[PDB]
Structure formats: structure tokens, C-alpha cells
Design a protein around this ligand. Structure first.
Ligand SMILES: [Ca+2]
Lengths: 89, 27
């Protein structure tokens, strides 16, 4: 259950959260609503030198998005950040 | 297979953690 994330997030230090929170604000550099969509991710990938298809971006979000809403919020972003880091424990 | 941006590239893209030149990967 998402309980694992709760404990992982709760354990996280205030400084660690602030660092990720700062990135979140930057990520929405392309969103006025403060939400992260394919457009925001598309810009990030573009800088990295990657320019795939929009269909792939949508599918990627679905993989991380449990609701499949196609959008990523702060809560989802935080979970994704921790999940990605844990992936390599 | 042939995954992209495992996490190192992303960390460099933004502030996050320097993690030096690697985390727990040999060379
Ligand atoms: Ca979602």
C-alpha cells in the first residue's frame, strides 16, 4: 500500500523535502496552474537532448500515474522521486 | 531494456543532489 511511501516520506528530513520541493516549482516552469503535464516533461527532455513522441510521454505518465489522469501533482511527484531513488537501494 | 535517464541525468538537469560522479555504481 502507499503506506510505504508515507513512512519513507515522513522519515525524509525537512531539508531533503525542500530540495525536491524546489525542483517541483522549477518543473512547472511551463505550467501556470502549477501542475506538471507532458508539456513540462517535454521541455525537460528537450534540454536533455531527447525528443521522442508525445504518445510516449503520455504512456510514461500513466505508468507513474495510478489514476492515469495523465497529470502529475506534488504528491505524485514526491512519490515518483522516492520510488525512483529506492529503485536502486 | 535500454532504459533512459535512470536518475543520474535527471539529477544533473536539476539541483537535487550532486551524488558526485555516481551513487553506488562501479565506474
Ligand atoms: Ca495522477
Amino acid at each position: 500500500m502507499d503506506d510505504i511511501y508515507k513512512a519513507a516520506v515522513e522519515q525524509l528530513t525537512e531539508e531533503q523535502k525542500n530540495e525536491f520541493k524546489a525542483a517541483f516549482d522549477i518543473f512547472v516552469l511551463g505550467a501556470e496552474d502549477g501542475c506538471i503535464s507532458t508539456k513540462e516533461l517535454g521541455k525537460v527532455m528537450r534540454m536533455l537532448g531527447q525528443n521522442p513522441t508525445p504518445e510516449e510521454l503520455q504512456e510514461m505518465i500513466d505508468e507513474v500515474d495510478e489514476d492515469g489522469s495523465g497529470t502529475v501533482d506534488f504528491d505524485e511527484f514526491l512519490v515518483m522521486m522516492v520510488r525512483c531513488m529506492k529503485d536502486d537501494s | 531494456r535500454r532504459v533512459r535517464i535512470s536518475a543520474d541525468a535527471m539529477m544533473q538537469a536539476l539541483l537535487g543532489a550532486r551524488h558526485k560522479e555516481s551513487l553506488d555504481l562501479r565506474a
